[PDB]
UniProtKB/Swiss-Prot annotation:
Primary location: cytoplasm
Name used for this protein in its record: Phosphatidylinositol 4,5-bisphosphate 3-kinase catalytic subunit gamma isoform
Its EC number(s): 2.7.1.137, 2.7.1.153, 2.7.1.154, 2.7.11.1
Modified residues (Phosphothreonine): T765
Region (Catalytic loop): 698-706
Domain PI3K/PI4K catalytic, residue spans: 552-821
Disease: Immunodeficiency 97 with autoinflammation: An autosomal recessive disorder with variable features. Affected individuals have childhood-onset antibody defects, cytopenias, and T lymphocytic pneumonitis and colitis. Some patients may have features of hemophagocytic lymphohistiocytosis.
Originating species: Homo sapiens
Length: 834
């Protein structure tokens, strides 16, 4: 390649955090094949994107405007403040007025201008009703004013893109590990599993042998499955037991070819189920890791139901996603497959009833799929679609009909589910997949989706040896089409994160309570960085529309919180920014912020769900991005303190919690009596939202040091990485004006809200369960494909009328009353002292 073409790939590499041209850790060309394969989807989408829409990235939705926002518009009038220089003129508008019209009613009171939000790279442009812009909806909910500046549209030139019937068998040669302890005397054997969507088709193990650094077997393992019966995507799973090591090899390759020949596979060690176990990547660390040597030496392609069985069938289909299928259930599902195909909700269980280890059945299964009239006309059910993209499905045709459904998601909804879509790539047998191409397409079509796609990917690439390789191929494909302007923005962001992280680690390795000394070191380090050299503005990775300028080193500090987190403040790079407020970012090692990311995203989904039912529980899912191993960034919400601090103020380092302090804190913090009363109601709304959300997720029992509140009454939980269903302590209860078995107007309001909030979530039980399940598989350590997952099943009272459920939750609230400060107090003894 050219001297400059090389220098382009180094740039990508630095952006990616991984080198997709390195081939030290492959035994085939699937990654490189995927690179070339992804060229066609990339160019297609880049070739088909409107340059101007793309450059301006309008953030819109096609959902109805919630009942709670209509009410704020009691005139069918919407005021917009337009800004030009120092001048400023407000303009009445109809909620249905497109920006081209609003412009046109304005030059009435040279037409190549565009309405941009003040202090943001956010544009109100395009043929969408003014009421259908997310920013406009955001202002309304909060009671904030829509301020827009009239300026020139961004030049799309900046967005330039750089130009057989034999039974299967496998010979296990031996295992090799360089150094083991002396020793103790252990015994070992090799387990070989033919897997498909975590379904084991057959299993053979070798005999036991004393665990030495080299163990040779030279043995053929003969399986019962015929070569012609192997399904594409089946894994050869190789495991060592004393279980200590595992590695996987795809039996059918990306070219539909039977794997053949000599392999030396460096395995992964178990630390002390999860999607890492599924990876087709081998350990990069060839010098320390256990290695296994094997050899391969073996190419592909009615009657109406009796009333009682259908009833039996329907009772099966109506059950939840975590419900086990019996042998009888699968035989029923399958025998009556044609009837089953008419029910979209049956699809996951139906496709779990497939004998994937039998070629004729799979063939019949494909026959089923060609008559997908009922599936293709059905309304998108994201919960349902997601269930087909999890670890239970390895068949690419099955996974493809799910992705097909995702095609109709609009940007607004693709964002909601993006994080978990990206995580779902881990369940893909192959690097190139429909899901992967989908993500690729949607990122290249929309800068906001693309920005978040980038950071999500880069997050896994930086802490996942198991899947970094695959993702990097995908991230590269995206960066080769997002265009020059973004490349630069990304570069800026990456430099910033890499420099601040360096500062973060360096600061932590100085102590374990507070130090005038360490604060002084921090500011000094920041002085060196600010000049020189750190990009002179950079987009905020969790709030892309926002541009951070220069540090306000005076306001920066080291928080006395544990892992010694950096509290950072920035000026806004955009001078057209109304307020004079800084941009606050916490930078912290070492929490596994991936968990925090996932909890917060599900939180945003709960918000969206509630939105469909015209509810606003006032959640505050602040931005959070895991950038690397136990390191990442967190959005600082302005004017917010922890409930714990509120209580350490009036009393010292106790303990002796008081009921009235919180209300007291709100009145002090309220300028008028009108603002106070708004804060009191907002507290009631934000409290209820978190009580419900944390309970359904099983993270309700928290110490109040992990619960915050805004000066405006917005309660919110943080740090997601006897007992209580959630935190509803006397202080919260006092604010609503009640204490100890004494209802009240604000408290009836509270209850009533929770129930509505609760029963609404239950209408989306399956979605919540699949997202939870996946979250656990791709986001938390090894788990139990049983008990962890089942908490939420119990929490959402699966299989009960709305009446029992309402009463279930009210009961949960009563548990809180009865416990009072008992549980907080306990938390205090434990976390504060021992
Ligand atoms: C005592 C100090 C240093 O003078 C400050 C410390 C900051 N506190 C508030 C505070 C404390 C701990 C916090 N901890 C987190 C946090 C979140 N997730 C994880 N994993 N770890 C820590 N987030 C916070 N918020 C969140 C957004 O609002 C502002 C910061 C946060 N705020 C006020 C006085």
């Amino acid at each position: 390649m050219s001297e400059e073409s090389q220098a382009f790939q180094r740039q990508l590499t630095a952006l990616i955090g991984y080198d997709v041209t390195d081939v030290s850790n492959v035994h085939d060309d699937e990654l490189e094949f995927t690179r070339r394969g992804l060229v066609t989807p990339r160019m297609a989408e880049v070739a088909s994107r409107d340059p101007k829409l793309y450059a301006m990235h309008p953030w819109v939705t096609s959902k109805p405007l919630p009942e709670y926002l209509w009410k704020k518009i009691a005139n069918n009038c919407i005021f917009i403040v337009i800004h030009r220089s120092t001048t400023s003129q407000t303009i009445k508008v109809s909620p249905d007025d497109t920006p081209g019209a609003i412009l046109q009613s304005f030059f009435t009171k040279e037409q190549d201008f565009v309405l941009r939000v003040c202090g943001r790279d956010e544009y109100l442009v395009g043929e969408t009703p003014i009421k259908n812009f997310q920013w406009v909806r955001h202002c309304l909910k909060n009671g904030e004013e829509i301020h827009v500046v009239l300026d020139t549209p961004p030049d799309p030139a900046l967005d330039e893109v750089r130009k057989c019937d034999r039974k299967f068998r496998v010979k296990i040669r031996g295992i090799d590990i360089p150094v083991l302890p002396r020793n103790t005397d252990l015994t070992v054997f090799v387990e070989a599993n033919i897997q498909h969507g975590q379904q084991v088709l057959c299993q053979r193990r070798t005999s036991p042998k004393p665990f030495t650094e080299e163990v040779l077997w030279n043995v053929w393992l003969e399986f019962s499955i015929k070569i012609k019966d192997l399904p594409k995507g089946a894994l050869l799973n190789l495991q060592i037991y004393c279980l200590l090591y595992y590695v996987n090899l795809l039996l059918i390759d990306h070219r539909f070819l039977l794997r053949r020949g000599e392999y030396v596979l460096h395995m992964w060690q178990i630390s002390g189920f999860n999607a890492d176990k599924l990876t087709s990547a081998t350990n990069p660390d060839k010098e320390n890791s256990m290695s296994i040597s094997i050899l391969l030496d073996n190419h592909p392609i009615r009657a109406e139901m009796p009333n009682q069985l259908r009833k039996q069938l329907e009772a099966i289909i109506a059950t939840d996603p975590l419900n086990p299928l019996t042998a009888e259930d699968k035989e029923l599902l399958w025998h009556f497959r044609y009837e089953s195909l008419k029910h979209p909700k049956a699809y996951p269980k139906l496709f779990s009833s497939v004998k994937w280890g039998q070629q004729e059945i799979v063939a019949k299964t494909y026959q089923l799929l060609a008559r997908r009239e009922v599936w293709d006309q059905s309304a998108l059910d994201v919960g349902l679609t997601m269930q087909l993209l999890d670890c239970n499905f390895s068949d690419e045709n099955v996974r493809a009909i799910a992705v097909q459904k995702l095609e109709s998601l609009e940007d607004d909804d693709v964002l909601h589910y993006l994080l978990q879509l990206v995580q779902a790539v881990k369940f893909e047998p192959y690097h190139d997949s429909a899901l992967a191409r989908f993500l690729l397409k949607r990122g290249l079509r929309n800068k906001r989706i693309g920005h978040f796609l980038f950071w999500f990917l880069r997050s896994e690439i930086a802490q996942s040896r198991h899947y970094q390789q695959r993702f990097a191929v995908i991230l590269e494909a995206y960066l080769r089409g997002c265009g020059t302007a973004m490349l630069h923005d990304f570069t800026q962001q990456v430099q910033v994160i890499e420099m601040l992280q360096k500062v973060t680690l360096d600061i932590k390795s100085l102590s374990a309570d507070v130090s005038s000394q360490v604060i002084s070191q921090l500011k000094q380090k920041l002085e060196n960085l600010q000049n020189s050299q750190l990009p002179e503005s950079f987009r905020v990775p969790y709030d892309p529309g926002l541009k951070a300028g220069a540090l306000a080193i005076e306001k920066c500090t080291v928080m006395a919180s544990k892992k010694k987190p950096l509290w950072l403040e920035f000026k806004c790079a955009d001078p057209t920014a109304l307020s004079n407020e800084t941009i606050g970012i916490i930078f912290k090692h070492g929490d596994d912020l991936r968990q925090d990311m996932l909890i917060l995203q599900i939180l945003r989904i709960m918000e969206s769900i509630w939105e469909t039912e015209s509810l606003d529980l006032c959640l505050l899912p602040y931005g959070c991005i895991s950038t690397g191993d136990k390191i990442g960034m967190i959005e600082i919400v302005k004017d917010a303190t922890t409930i714990a601090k509120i209580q350490q103020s009036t009393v010292g380092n106790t303990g002796a919690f008081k009921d009235e302090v919180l209300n007291h804190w709100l009145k002090e913090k309220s300028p008028t009596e009108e603002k106070f009363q708004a804060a009191v109601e907002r507290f009631v709304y934000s409290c209820a939202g978190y009580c419900v959300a944390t309970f359904v997720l099983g993270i309700g029992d928290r110490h109040n040091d992990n619960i915050m509140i805004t000066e405006t009454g917005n309660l919110f939980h943080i740090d997601f990485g006897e007992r209580v269903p959630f935190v509803l302590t006397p202080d919260f209860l006092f604010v609503m004006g009640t204490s100890g078995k004494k209802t009240s107007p604000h408290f009836q309001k509270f209850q009533d809200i929770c129930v509505k909030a609760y029963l609404a979530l239950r209408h989306h039980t399956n979605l919540l369960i699949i997202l939870f399940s996946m979250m656990l598989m791709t986001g938390m350590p090894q788990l139990t494909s049983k008990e962890d997952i089942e908490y939420i099943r119990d929490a959402l009272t699966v299989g009960k009328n709305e009446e029992d459920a309402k009463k279930y939750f009210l009961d949960q609230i009563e548990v809180c009353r009865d416990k009072g400060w008992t549980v907080q107090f306990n938390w205090f003894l434990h976390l504060v002292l021992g």
